[PDB]
């Protein structure tokens with residue numbers, strides 16, 4: 167199961183609405199049924215003159231393990247979209263492993279407003295794709311997304327009823343790490 171070839175960013179989106187503060191994933195849809203562990207995620211993306219750099223956190227809800235990353239790449243000219251390389255870091259943002267240039271993720275913004283966003287992520291590890299991942303984002307953990315963002319979900323051809331909500335998973339976040 168490859169990522170979809172029919173994902174594009176919403177035109178007209180204000181990048182300022184996306185590159186703000188920290189995001190928490192409130193809801194996710196992973197199209198590959200083979201993927202079984204559920205994660206919580208939070209991240210803080212920043213942009214300067216077309217370069218994106220972001221600090222990312224995952225917590226595996228089933229195992230109570232976590233990992234940290236720093237991603238970096240360039241904004242596409244065509245819309246709010248980037249393909250990032252990523253390194254592995256500790257909680258103090260020291261590098262553990264430099265980026266493997268055979269791996270990347272492509273993040274496409276589908277909607278963003280002051281409180282909420284919807285993004286699509288295609289993670290690739292060499293040959294292999296992870297399958298489509300859709301994440302509904304809010305700035306406050308366990309808040310509901312806006313009506314505008316919920317509309318974006320339907321308009322992406324999805325149903326919110328199918329998403330996993332993270333607020334009931336027993337997440338632990340490292341809010342020190344995502345506060346820049």
Ligand code: HEM
Pocket residue numbers: 191194196201203204205206207209222224235252269271273287289291296301332
């Ligand atoms: C709750 C939402 C999310 C879930 C369920 C999820 C799920 C996963 C899973 C299952 C893996 C491991 C893949 C493997 O074992 O190789 C993974 C890794 C990864 N994810 Fe997430 N993810 C989420 C959000 C995101 C976000 C928002 C980003 C980027 C902004 C992202 C970027 C990455 C990266 C960079 C890796 C590392 C791949 C590696 O270690 O080489 N994820 N994610």
